[PDB]
Design a protein around this ligand. Structure first.
Ligand SMILES: CNCCN1CCC(c2ccc3[nH]c(-c4ccccc4OC)c(F)c3c2)CC1
Ligand SMILES: CNCCN1CCC(c2ccc3[nH]c(-c4ccccc4OC)c(F)c3c2)CC1
Ligand SMILES: CNCCN1CCC(c2ccc3[nH]c(-c4ccccc4OC)c(F)c3c2)CC1
Ligand SMILES: CNCCN1CCC(c2ccc3[nH]c(-c4ccccc4OC)c(F)c3c2)CC1
Ligand SMILES: Nc1ncnc2c1ncn2[C@@H]1O[C@H](C[C@@H](N)CC[C@H](N)C(=O)O)[C@@H](O)[C@H]1O
Ligand SMILES: Nc1ncnc2c1ncn2[C@@H]1O[C@H](C[C@@H](N)CC[C@H](N)C(=O)O)[C@@H](O)[C@H]1O
Ligand SMILES: Nc1ncnc2c1ncn2[C@@H]1O[C@H](C[C@@H](N)CC[C@H](N)C(=O)O)[C@@H](O)[C@H]1O
Ligand SMILES: Nc1ncnc2c1ncn2[C@@H]1O[C@H](C[C@@H](N)CC[C@H](N)C(=O)O)[C@@H](O)[C@H]1O
Lengths: 343, 343, 343, 343
């Protein structure tokens, strides 16, 4: 299928195994900012659902389909590829909605829907928005979308901003320097030290932080889900030019994302920004092995390039330079393999 | 090969991917009880290594091979299936031991050794000793062992003992009762509560605990690595009959393990027992979904059956009864998916 | 002379220039622990001075000769090589002691005394006791000492103890990692990092610290000034074996020293130990480029070798290992270029 | 050579020993105003470098030669007399510029260049501009300059202005009054008080200050490096006539300096003025022996005479008088021995 061609088996097996756990579904459900904003977006745009045909891509427990039902949808196809599909079905019966919600087990790239739909709803966002590559399945699902059908969410904004955080940098750096020691139990590791630093700084750091650590206004990259094609997400190039508001060491870029549900009655935003209340997405920071020094008023420019891989994630390339000194930093980060720092 | 036949391709990819991270090797290296006891066991039995031919099964960073070198081995074949084999080679050069340590990339079931060896060393122990099924690879490797060659470690003891821990027990329900609510954003979740309970109880719990929770002297199950065959580990039946030292509710069995390096000069023990300083193996507890009441002097009898699966782990069956009352409990856990509870 | 033989005339120029400043004399005089203890040692041992002939080696302002005069000496030869000799003479006249204190300009190795003395007094101690190599001039002066004449101070103890101090280690490390950066104004410095780390870690660090950072009881090395010869100080080998009292990272050895004035009436001690009030000698710490890990109960053994150079200082060699793991550290330091960190 | 003849070899040893430390090169490199302005001056005047032959006098780490290389120079001879030359060579190789930057170990007065150059670059400025007498080596290098070749920097301005700083003046006596006590542990020290005072006053003070202590617009003395000869710097007479903008006690003269890189495209200024951000040159203050009352509108006139010595520095003679009042003072200062007072 489109899905298996882009996905290593051993990756897909881990992936849907993970979403097969009630405890992981619960973890998403309990993100109240997440779950309550989806519900508001759907219920306050009830005219977008009343008597409509809906597709829920990756329905998990079914929770968004129940919201579509609460908003008056006529029929909701809830597609789910993990064994969580069987639990969703149980909930549909115990909630007496068998006449309106139809669970369809399988990958949205591989199942058959009986008819085209008025609106697709999903929660396909990973870390940094793009992790997991589920946004492609969401876009793929537009093959079932009627002309001028809507998408909920409708657009996604990824934000990047340079940050300073010596304590985080040193913390990762101290980790790598285990492999600097010349006599670990009589053994000289130091020859692997470079490869260690590379491996640790490959990991994006997932947690939250104070906005005070940000040294410039964020740059925004927007994906419009109504318009984008799957292939748009195979290679994502995000150019940036920051105007430094503070002097200091730039330790890397911080990422977060917002999505907007652009309904007929109103637009509702769900934000994972550090100025907003914390969600289970936290935020993400990619460190530089070698931080850049900049002065307030310098411009920091470069590119963040995300290249999709068959492990349902991205290889991240970040090149940045302080234009005023030509100090340049190059980094590649493996998004599939984040360091979850949050405590 | 023997390995590819007992192991799903996708489990193996994830498995050797995991050991490909320097950070994971580092995690094992930094277990000081682990690493220092291996070094002591080897160096204090130097006559077992002096001018010998050695096989290191799953050498990882190479660390144990270097200990064999420090003890005077003539030649060490260090076999390693993950990409960590490349880093090990780097260390062997930078430590100027290319004349004595030979790294051989691949699974010990699939590579060729040039010659038979005097002694096999390995650290193949998972959670509960048996997890990961690397003990089978260690046993398999005996095809390269000279007659009367030795094995380091030489034997492994798994210990089981009943525990009482009301807090751990009730945690499971407090978690699952997330689903016991008639209107979570309007949805009645309650029909999934039993499944959520089942799901948590299927997970063995990894962490340590005060030995005061133990209710009877442990029972011991021993694997002699000089003698055992691979197939002995496909189905491990561990009968038990505990004589209750304390009165209370038994909530499950706790597991830990020791290995002994029985050398020519001395026997060295590595223990992960809760009476001993903590190691990165912690201990493991499997809950009964129905506790059992035993008074001091009663006997709690039953069987712990471990059935190897192709996910490199075991399905655990525990049946237990209080002989004096006849009340019974029986539980299934998946050792491939432990709950890591330690903080 | 013996002095110009062992000293670059260059070094000796700067050295006596330095002591030619009243402000530097003032700096030693104002060390109240230093100056008050000398005065106590001399005045409380007044029988060792009453009607005696005294030599003051390197009299500076003259201060110690005045103490000898206060204790009743008959005649004091006050030898001083810097231009400070002229100011000393001024003080002798204005204090009306021309009949008892006789200033003699010159190096003690190069002047002529009219007669042999009953007692030599001096304050010849540098950082780590030995810096400046003035202890050799003090020993050299014994050519003027009558049989069974005394020396004040009489003995010196150097103390060594291992310490942990991650903040100091990182401070120094962070300095050297400047030479780690790949694009400093567009220039890759990283080739020089090894050499930068070598340079920074050669610098002994002078300042004080809480004794909480010491990980074992100090080892003591004693020089008995009555007995030692000049040449004994050319190459000082200090073997050590620390029984670790705390687990953690050993970042280096800390050094301090005591001298004793063993008089006829009492023995007075001048200590620069970190348990004692601060002197202008502070304490000295030699850092390892990579700390050694150790456990309480381990022994840390090795050698501190001091080799005198013609810059009036020492090249310091420290080799240490953790006996239990064979973990080893070798370091070379440059006592003639200490980093004065105190503030 | 010219260098040896004007320099005591022990001063030279000490001098090039100092620049042999990576930490000292680092200290200049990290002065961002210094290093960034040199880089701007060179890169913004790239036509002055593109395909040119360049001489870097005293290249240190090589940093300026790399800027010349970034601006497109064809060939750069980087001359360096300290052992830093060896580290510069390492950087030239690791930055793959061996085809364009040629390191030449030795004094610029003593080496041979293969050819004449289009432009000399250097950072030869000491405290008060002239300290270290490296400006003469810079001028001496013009023997290798093609006709109408350029010099970067092209001119230097020394600025002098009178300051009032009652606290700084009084601090000299407060320090010297240490000596003014009749019984310091029994000794009358007071006879040395005048010598202490003289000693402190001979030291120019290095630190920065609030510009409000300045009493008059600075007077400027200019060296045009394109025109000046070495000999011009042996005796530098700087007359001054300050038009007092403020009434009060004048305690001395403050010094700072600017240099200009007059390129084909633009002129870039590096300033160490107290109105500008701090550099590692700070500013320099010389006290009068007695303060002079001046009214705003009065004129304070006299001469600052700098006489080069063989310690690579200057004896400074300052004579000043308030023209309207006849009131007069002076001082003699030794620039080799400045007092570093900043914190
Ligand atoms: C789509 N909505 C997700 C909402 N939310 C769920 C929980 C969190 C999360 C974070 C990292 C992850 N890696 C894989 C994965 C597991 C196996 C194989 C490949 C994988 O990703 C590349 C995941 F499922 C996964 C889920 C954060 C995001
Ligand atoms: C043999 N010596 C290891 C010593 N030590 C290493 C770190 C710890 C550990 C714990 C659980 C694990 N599951 C898998 C796994 C990963 C992928 C697929 C299946 C897996 O297990 C069934 C692991 F590697 C793994 C490693 C505890 C034991
Ligand atoms: C003998 N009593 C000393 C008392 N006390 C005085 C002040 C302190 C001190 C510290 C380091 C020093 N290096 C040189 C030096 C200066 C020039 C040339 C070589 C040098 O040392 C290797 C010094 F004078 C000197 C003095 C600490 C000790
Ligand atoms: C040429 N550009 C230098 C830029 N910058 C470097 C660091 C600072 C500085 C200040 C005083 C100094 N005296 C000697 C010296 C050392 C030995 C012998 C005689 C000496 O001075 C006359 C120095 F190196 C030296 C360097 C301030 C200036
Ligand atoms: N190609 C795919 N086909 C079907 N389901 C998928 C696919 N990719 C991911 N999923 C499911 O999408 C879900 C992602 C969750 N973030 C959302 C769950 C649910 N919509 C909620 O809002 O709680 C998981 O249940 C996945 O197993
Ligand atoms: N069948 C196998 N063939 C080769 N290596 C294996 C096999 N199974 C596991 N390994 C490796 O064995 C190692 C197991 C570790 N517990 C030991 C690492 C290392 N010997 C140490 O003591 O630090 C991992 O690096 C695995 O990739
Ligand atoms: N070989 C030498 N001959 C004469 N004086 C020396 C020699 N070496 C060092 N000195 C002087 O000894 C003094 C050392 C000071 N620590 C002591 C000064 C004085 N005794 C006091 O206690 O205040 C300085 O004045 C040195 O210049
Ligand atoms: N006559 C001389 N010949 C060669 N190098 C000299 C001479 N005089 C001084 N130097 C060097 O000039 C350098 C002075 C520094 N201000 C400049 C270093 C470097 N070009 C930079 O700008 O970072 C030191 O490295 C000195 O050793």
């Amino acid at each position: 299928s489109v899905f298996s061609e882009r996905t290593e088996e051993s990756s897909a097996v881990q992936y849907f195994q993970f979403y097969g756990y009630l405890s992981q579904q619960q973890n998403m459900m309990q993100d109240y900012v997440r779950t309550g904003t989806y519900q508001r977006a759907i219920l306050q745009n009830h005219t977008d659902f009343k008597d409509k045909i809906v597709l829920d891509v990756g329905c998990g427990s079914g929770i968004l389909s129940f919201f579509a039902a609460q908003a008056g949808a006529r029929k909701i196809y809830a597609v789910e590829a993990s064994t969580m599909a069987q639990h969703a079905e149980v909930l549909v019966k115990s909630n007496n909605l068998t006449d309106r919600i139809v669970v369809i087990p399988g990958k949205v790239e591989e199942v058959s829907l009986p008819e085209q739909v008025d609106i697709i709803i999903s929660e396909p966002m990973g870390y940094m928005l793009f992790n997991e590559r589920m946004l492609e399945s969401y876009l793929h699902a537009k093959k079932y979308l009627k002309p001028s059908g809507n998408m909920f969410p409708t657009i996604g904004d990824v934000h990047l901003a340079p940050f300073t955080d010596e304590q985080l940098y040193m913390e990762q750096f101290t980790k790598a320097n285990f492999w600097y020691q010349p006599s670990f139990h009589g053994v000289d590791l130091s020859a692997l030290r470079g490869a260690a630093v590379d491996e640790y700084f490959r990991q994006p750091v997932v947690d939250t932080f104070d906005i005070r650590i940000l040294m410039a206004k964020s740059v925004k990259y927007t994906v419009n889900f109504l318009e984008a094609k799957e292939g748009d997400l195979h290679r994502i190039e995000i150019p940036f030019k920051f105007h430094m508001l503070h002097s200091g060491l730039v330790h890397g870029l911080a990422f977060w994302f917002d999505v907007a549900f652009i309904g007929s009655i109103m637009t509702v935003w769900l934000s994972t920004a550090p100025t907003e209340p914390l969600t289970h997405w936290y935020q993400v920071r990619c460190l530089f092995q070698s931080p850049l020094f900049a002065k307030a008023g310098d411009t920091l420019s470069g590119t963040c390039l995300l290249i999709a891989n068959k492990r349902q994630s991205y290889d991240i390339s970040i090149v940045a330079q302080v234009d005023q000194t030509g100090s340049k930093s190059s980094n590649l980060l493996d998004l599939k393999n984040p360091f979850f720092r949050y405590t």
